[PDB]
Amino acid sequence: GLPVMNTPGSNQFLTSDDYQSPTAMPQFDVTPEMNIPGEVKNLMEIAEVDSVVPVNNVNE
Amino acid sequence: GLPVMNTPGSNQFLTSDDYQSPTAMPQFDVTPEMNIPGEVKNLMEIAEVDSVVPVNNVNENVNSLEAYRIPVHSVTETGAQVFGFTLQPGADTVMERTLLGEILNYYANWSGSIKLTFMYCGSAMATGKFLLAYSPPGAGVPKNRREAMLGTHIIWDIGLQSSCVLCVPWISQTHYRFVSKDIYTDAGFITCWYQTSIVVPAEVQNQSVILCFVSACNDFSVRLLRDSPFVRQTAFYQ
Amino acid sequence: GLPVMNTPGSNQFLTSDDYQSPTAMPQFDVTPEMNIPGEVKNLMEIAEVDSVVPVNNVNE
Amino acid sequence: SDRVRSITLGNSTITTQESANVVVGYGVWPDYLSDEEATAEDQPTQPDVATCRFYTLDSVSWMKESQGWWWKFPDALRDMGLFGQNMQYHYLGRSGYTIHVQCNASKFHQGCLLVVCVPEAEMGAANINEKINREHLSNGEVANTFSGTKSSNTNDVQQAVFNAGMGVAVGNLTIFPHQWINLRTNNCATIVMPYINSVPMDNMFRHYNFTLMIIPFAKLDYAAGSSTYIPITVTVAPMCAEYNGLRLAGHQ
Amino acid sequence: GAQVSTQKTGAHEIHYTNINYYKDAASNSANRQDFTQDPGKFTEPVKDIMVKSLPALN
Amino acid sequence: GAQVSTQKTGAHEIHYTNINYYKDAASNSANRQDFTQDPGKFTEPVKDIMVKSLPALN
Amino acid sequence: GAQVSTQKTGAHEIHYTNINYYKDAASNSANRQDFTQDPGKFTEPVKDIMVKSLPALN
Amino acid sequence: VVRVADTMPSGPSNSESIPALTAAETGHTSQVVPSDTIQTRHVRNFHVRSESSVENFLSRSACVYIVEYKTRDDTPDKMYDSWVINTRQVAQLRRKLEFFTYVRFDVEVTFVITSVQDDSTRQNTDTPALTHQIMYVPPGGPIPQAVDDYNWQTSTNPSVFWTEGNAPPRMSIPFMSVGNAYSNFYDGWSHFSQTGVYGFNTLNNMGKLYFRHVNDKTISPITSKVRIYFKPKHVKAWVPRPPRLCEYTHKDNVDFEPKGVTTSRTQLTISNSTH
Amino acid sequence: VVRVADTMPSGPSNSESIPALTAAETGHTSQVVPSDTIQTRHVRNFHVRSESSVENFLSRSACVYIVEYKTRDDTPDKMYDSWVINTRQVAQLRRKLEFFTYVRFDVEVTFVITSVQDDSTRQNTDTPALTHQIMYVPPGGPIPQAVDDYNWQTSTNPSVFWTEGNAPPRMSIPFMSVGNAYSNFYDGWSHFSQTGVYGFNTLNNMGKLYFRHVNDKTISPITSKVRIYFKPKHVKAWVPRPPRLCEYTHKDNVDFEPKGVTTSRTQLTISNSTH
Amino acid sequence: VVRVADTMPSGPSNSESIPALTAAETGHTSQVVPSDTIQTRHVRNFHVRSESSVENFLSRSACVYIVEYKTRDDTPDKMYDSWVINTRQVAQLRRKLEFFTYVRFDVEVTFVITSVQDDSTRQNTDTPALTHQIMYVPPGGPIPQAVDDYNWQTSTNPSVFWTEGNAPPRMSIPFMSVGNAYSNFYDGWSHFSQTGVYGFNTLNNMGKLYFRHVNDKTISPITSKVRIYFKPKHVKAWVPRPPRLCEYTHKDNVDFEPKGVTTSRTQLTISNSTH
């Protein structure tokens, strides 16, 4: 067939992999998408909200 | 799927591999790049800088700063030899530890010309002349000033312009020499002789000091990587 | 990844192979080429030269 | 001729008559920090006359047996006027420099100095697993001194001239921006030095940016009637100095 | 059926190639290049918006 | 999304093919074909440059 | 960056595909299709050439 | 394609031009070509400064540390091993990196794992293939304290698994400095009062690796030894400096004993004699 | 390519503009830029909010459960193991998912299978390579009750087979909810009379996995332990909520013991003293 | 596509043309075609001088040396083996290369590694897969003197690792001569006074290989024997010369014993008799 050569890094499982993998359920009909208020696209949207600081954390 | 065939050389780790490998941290935001003065894009930019040659490495002069001083003074008759070494940038003990000797000691073949610059560090009222000869091999060492003036030489007069340049020409059989020593690629002999003596007036010191420099020209090259013969460790550095 | 299938003849070493193999010294500067008289491009250039025949090969 | 050079930075002027040339860094002249390379967000402080001017350090005497000297340079100007005060009140500093070294003789004296300006001269110790005190790496405007042999003092730098305190060959030390003070042609050595660091601004007490080194290769020598006392005087002027992060005075 | 798009590089100083191989959209790789945001529903979630210089509760 | 460039060959007597496969620039191969230089900042690092034939410190 | 060339076939009765994959010219396959020759330097290596019908040493 | 400079021809000269007389007191390296002093011919020079670039010089894989760990022991600390990440415990890669003061490069990391059956009474076993785990902890993460600790889950930390007999594991790592270049040397202190530690030990802060066997307690001890190979690629380098003469002593400081500058000759003038 | 906002320069001001005075009583977060209070310079800022997105934050593989089963036993229930599928038995992936109330994502499942020879008298065997079977049962299917049960045929159920020594098995799974988002929290009952169970245990209903050795009864016991790694990809997330302070107790409820809000200081004003 | 020359037809002739009379005393090979002497017909000839070219003749992999080394011994020099690199220890590849005086070719190197368990008392072991290391030292590098020596790190030297059971390792090597062609014969001395060594031993200088087992001391001796296969490709060849009649003796010189020119006939004229 086609001659190929395996590099180092073959047959490993890295946690930050971004490859493609076959579905266990082909042609599965996903339920439709509904517009829900309050979508988060970035945690920096959350981190810009004011929240109270416990300054008086002194001995119980 | 696609039928493929594995060749020899599969599943090995070669040190000089140039393949692609997946990142352990995807989408990692690298810090921005800042313009810093003094960027090196080639080690040949470093190897073209002058640096001082320890000519006087004679029997415990290396454990001081005296190894750089070439002693010179007024002579009795004329025509004596000042110093001398062999043109081996990387195997000769004189220019072994120089910057050209270090960078050439990370390589195995070299090619191109070599500048030798001599700075006279004596007094402003003293004069003198010298003969800076290069002799390609095949004969032996020139044993007097008569046999030295038959090669590539230059007469240097000491005046206002305090330094001379002996530019050693590239004269070779092949295109590249070897950095280590062998009989086939031998390069020659650098020698220095008294043309006329050092004439000095009264109440001025007689013995003075010549400093020596080495660098590469604009036609210089190195070819084969290897490890330096200088690195010697036994255990780890805990 | 890409689904592939190994044929017979995989992982063998044939002496008459004509494949590609990675260099042990990448970016090695080869010395230049010099025109030398007497280049041979074919052994049939050699076999067309006259050469003497030992006809009298009789008992020492 | 081109041997006469004049330099004016602020209210201080140096006129020399036997200069050689001026080495300018790695080709780069000192300039201010642009908005593309900037990191902090607040307005800097640019005094530009009260700061950018020549400060004269201590003169050191050069005998026949002297071995060398060094000064650390964001730290030798700790107590030099408004440069030192603006160092003490701010957190981030950024400047270039101009190092001019005076040494004079006659036409009967001989000798040769090497004026090197070494970035990140991280020095060794006299004892290998020992800590160096800060009074021996730097002392302000008072110079430290190399030694000719293997020094083995307590809490001190390894002072040997053939290793420059850093563990290299001292002949190979000419890769840095350097000049020579040759006593038959020279009188002075001007070195313009831009800002070289891995970050755009840095604190001027916790860091040592570079190290001036003056090492005599050809030893000083003279006859039985010439003048014995020959000083060496170093003068420095910050260039394009700016400051960021104002707070109270101190360093701890 | 290939698609070319830029890589994640730094500032002040690319073009990888991707081909999808499976019949479902659930086999595709992660969409790690959507850098957009809108904090107008968490910060400023009010009627009759404020102009940042007026006393605003004037 | 392929790129064709010349190989390292000798003098006096090519065109390989490279395709990048990963989404980051840190996965690419080494850039072993930049042969340029500039020794004007190590040699000749001075103000008021010298003309190589004049006495230069004249 | 592909190249198409003919195969070694017989007489009286093709077009393979080759792509180079490595950055050096020393990784390429063998050049087994140069069938040219010149026996003019081994046979006939003389000055004042001979015309094959004349006595030639006439 | 950038060649070296050709040699131009020259003839006899007699004038007030003096290319050989210069002054190195200005810190200036003379640009003297051999066609300025002697009579040279015309040489078309085809040499290429190719294998001397900063990319070709440093981009070679180099062993940086040896990591040893076992598969069954009495003490649990000898069943896993760790290493604070630095490039300064092998003198070859360290001395190659210390040509420059600041560097900027991507890293390519390759692990070579070998297993040796230890000496015991019950060496006649049938052991299945060992699987090793190499977990990288960014600076500040939780530290595992046993082989069975629950910090080995790698929910966020990068990790790699290798089954015995395959190719070595390889991953790439981007530029991870908080500044603009990896500072090879740092001349300064850690505290603002100029106390603490002196040297580059303040700016290391790169994290640390962890190694264990994924398999449980086996019935025979096996010593694993994994070697880490760094390959610096995509290299930029700034402000060079002379190479080190003296032999190193430690990883955290730069300290030394004084060494002679070069090897002695015992004479100063050559001759045709026993030289 | 979306940058963060630059800092614009400002000068001295004296007017009735008051950007610093606001009222947080309207539930409004003030949009005060540092160029509104102090004098700032112009900074071209090149930072990218890249590795803070909801896709980059959750798309990491995480161990969710450990499954242990053997290859020969006296009791047949210890030769296979099962797991009711939930993401709420490891606190790291659970606490990362509980930033939001509703989520929508495709799943990428990876199994890591390791085998350990148990302690016995006859450890000196020659065992061929084990093959494991991982069968997923959608909610309502038939349940196997032995390793030799005829429900292991996988005529309709998805399954995967792995031979020892290969790469880990990996498959992708689409969005399987009967509603429009995976409800991380459900405030409600199961029965319409508001009795039954309280919490998210009503809406779990995802099926359950089954694990066995395809090989038959071996002559030595071997303990297999397979670890399940979930990777949420193609992520959408809605209506955020504060992270959990207290340590979890169970998988099916949300219950806790009260924990202090933060760590104590024992003083209220800083000083230059022992602080 | 280059054919051989066709045969052109001819007829009867009677003239002063004499193609058969020539003089070989000028060193000239006669260009006599068979259509110059006898009557020939027209033959369209389709033969191709294809498998006689210098590329097709030399580009075959050939065993050049056998290298033997063990995995545990009393003496440490028998646990690794080395070989000074030459093509002149097997007579087949040497006699194929000695058709020409100067050659220029790229090399393709393939190693075939086989392992044999040595005879001992404790042959009943369970040995994991051996991994071998083949390190090439360019001329001048440091030499390892043990299997545990620290010169085996391959920080700059090329190396290759092979796990048992895979395909043979293969790498390509460019043209490495310091001159313009590999001098197969060198008629000259080493020293300028015409003393020293005589022959091609001065111009060899190609480096040397090193072989060891990456694994540590095993509990049973195993003898590894690796065979080196050279394949000359990208071939140019100059100034041919007659093949060798006599059998070789050594690798470093060309010396021999005189051999007869050919095999004897014992008569000089053929007949229809016992011939």
Ligand SMILES: CCCCCCCCCCCCC/C=C/[C@H](O)[C@H](N)CO
């Ligand atoms: C398990 C996957 C990730 C593997 C992590 C291993 C290495 C992590 C650190 C990457 C390499 C940094 C090494 C140090 C770089 C510089 O050379 C030093 N700061 C000194 O110059």
Ligand SMILES: CCCCCCCCCCCCC/C=C/[C@H](O)[C@H](N)CO
């Ligand atoms: C054998 C092939 C199929 C493998 C089946 C294994 C997993 C099956 C379920 C897919 C993943 C669903 C996990 C739960 C998703 C949500 O996080 C929870 N409902 C809670 O948010």
Ligand SMILES: CCCCCCCCCCCCC/C=C/[C@H](O)[C@H](N)CO
């Ligand atoms: C480990 C990777 C590198 C492998 C190194 C093995 C071989 C190194 C030398 C390459 C081949 C040169 C062999 C000699 C060539 C010529 O035939 C001879 N000089 C005689 O003609």
